[PDB]
Design a protein around this ligand. Structure first.
Ligand SMILES: COc1cc(Br)c(CC(=O)N2CCC[C@H](C(N)=O)C2)cc1OC
Ligand SMILES: [Zn+2]
Length: 140
């Protein structure tokens, strides 16, 4: 679990969105595994606006933040799951890293701010949903 809190927005994995998230929906995209809802209180996270390919992510199944090198946002095949069928997840970045169902939500960040959230994983893999192209998170 986990979310990004920027301005009056809450960014979560679409597959983990609550009823309150759907009832206060701003935007959602199943191909990216992202959903944004509105919040009453202002958040403290800042979004990175950069092309970093190195950063650090939080892994709840290890209670640890790990430094990682990650690929550029791309269209990557994701294995069937209890959440989406075999499909191309878009705007996804991969890294070698520990991951477990439970971990989606964790923030990946660089020196500039939040880069994205844990969305997929593998045997020694973890995938990240990029948010750096969502410029509207910084306003309104
Ligand atoms: C350790 O191997 C895995 C780690 C993880 Br985390 C996972 C879970 C995983 O990737 N997804 C499940 C939740 C929806 C997500 C999506 N964005 O489509 C895809 C599987 C794994 O293998 C089988
Ligand atoms: Zn950066």
């Amino acid at each position: 679990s986990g979310a990004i809190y920027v301005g009056n927005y809450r960014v979560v994995n679409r597959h983990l969105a609550t009823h309150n998230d759907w009832a206060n929906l701003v935007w959602e995209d199943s191909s990216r595994d992202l959903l944004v809802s509105s919040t009453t209180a202002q958040g403290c996270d800042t979004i990175a606006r950069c092309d970093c390919q190195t950063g650090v992510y939080y892994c709840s199944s290890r209670r640890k933040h790990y430094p990682v090198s990650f690929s550029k946002p791309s269209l990557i095949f994701v294995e069937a799951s209890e959440y989406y069928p075999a499909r191309y997840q878009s705007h996804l970045m991969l890294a070698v890293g520990h991951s477990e169902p439970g971990d989606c939500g964790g923030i990946l960040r660089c020196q500039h701010g939040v880069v994205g959230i844990v969305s997929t994983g593998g045997n020694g893999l973890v995938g990240f949903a990029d948010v750096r192209d969502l410029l509207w998170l910084d306003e309104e």
